[PDB]
Design a protein around this ligand. Structure first.
Ligand code: CL
Lengths: 255, 255
């Protein structure tokens, strides 16, 4: 019958188009993945930082891509909900190669950012990045899978040292990434309601914010976020970090 | 290399002989391992159940042993404190091969239990199990390393359906394992102060109890366990399980 892969991708893509706020908690292993499925979420994300910290490596494409894909494959085997994987800047792979690998690993979404770790953290030009996303969308289309390509820009995080007006750059970049065929966009580093509103209003696809699982997001509480029109919430490294802090405090009772 | 490993083992063994109450938190990856070292503990344990659940497998020797030793290797590389690994019933290896492999992975302690998962969960005879422990001690001795062999018995956990008086059996088994050269013993499944005290009193090596990082043990909290003479405390699957419960609760806010 139908590949599970294509079914999961269609569901994930449909959910992104629905207009609902999608919470896609960010996992790092089959244990954390299982917890997300058991909790009733409709999909999940895999964080590169927390996977790297849990597998003897570090963020910034220090992991071996093949080793990382092996972790993804275990996660996608362990759950029956759609899985998206943060592939950083693409690990020096062509967009078509990148898509082939994530599909082989059973994932139906990716994040791709504009800081190129294999090139000294060079910041891609806005159109150069949109073109990378466009080529990834082309490859997904050719493969016949509704991969949710979440186009990430680091513009706000890079800040005034890189861009005269980082918010104007972020808006430009998410518009271009939408035009390139991204089914979600992820302008990281936001802290205010005004930033969020401006970015939500610039595109017709979901805008992703990063939340702490207890502390939320700087722009406001979850009801405020929904009211601002935020359509994707992920945790990045902050679920793992929260567990770490919780553990550290509790271990003081033992030594 | 071997000098560092021998030094780690000697420190771990000396700590066991000292009389100190040793808390050795039970980890399942490099992330958890790091937290233990950061928190100031003098060694740690690797739990077979939580590793399996985090790597797409399950407890009871369903993991591939080579794949498990790869996780152990990452962990011993990530920390500079002694590491002990739960190797279940030995994965059908000879005691000498088992010791060879745990040393190659950088560990300086093991737990070995008497339910033989590769033989339909047959329970070893009491001397048969002691003999396995003795052969492992002999192999460590030949290797020149003070490996802390923590001899586990499942007698109390198996209970009266298997051993009509499971405490008599457990006491017998921990005494035989000490005679065989175990540097610690681990009669799992305990829930009362009466049980803990009588096992503590039966041997001159540490007795290991399993504690929940919040809820302690059936027999009491740390101070109470210490007063009963307990000298080794580990978490088994319970640190991971607590993080799971904590996570499951917090995830409800996002669902
Ligand atoms: Cl980060």
């Amino acid at each position: 019958g139908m590949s599970d892969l294509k079914s999961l991708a269609t569901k994930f893509a449909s959910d992104h188009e629905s207009g609902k706020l999608l919470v896609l908690p960010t996992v790092w292993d089959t244990w954390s993945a299982g917890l997300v499925e058991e909790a009733g979420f409709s999909g999940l994300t895999i964080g590169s930082h927390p996977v790297a910290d849990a597998t003897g490596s570090s963020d910034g494409e220090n992991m071996n891509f093949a080793d990382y894909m092996a972790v993804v494959k275990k996660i996608t085997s362990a759950v029956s909900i759609p899985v998206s994987v943060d592939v950083e800047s693409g690990y020096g792979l062509s967009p078509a190669d990148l898509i082939a690998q994530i599909l082989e690993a059973g994932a139906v979404g990716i994040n791709v950012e504009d800081v190129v770790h294999s090139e000294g953290k060079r910041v891609r030009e806005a159109q150069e990045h949109a073109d990378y996303i466009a080529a990834a969308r082309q490859a997904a289309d050719v493969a016949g899978v509704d991969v949710v390509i979440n186009g990430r820009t680091d513009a706000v995080k890079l800040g005034a040292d890189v861009f005269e007006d980082p918010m104007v750059e972020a808006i430009k970049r998410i518009k271009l990434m939408e035009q390139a065929g991204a089914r979600s966009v992820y302008p990281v580093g936001l802290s205010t309601a005004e930033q969020v509103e401006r970015l939500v209003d610039a595109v017709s696809v979901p805008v992703n914010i990063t939340a702490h699982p207890v502390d939320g997001h700087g722009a406001g509480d979850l009801a405020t976020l929904a009211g601002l029109g935020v359509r994707r919430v992920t945790f990045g490294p902050l679920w793992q970090k929260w567990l770490a802090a919780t553990s550290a405090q509790q271990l003081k009772g033992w030594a």
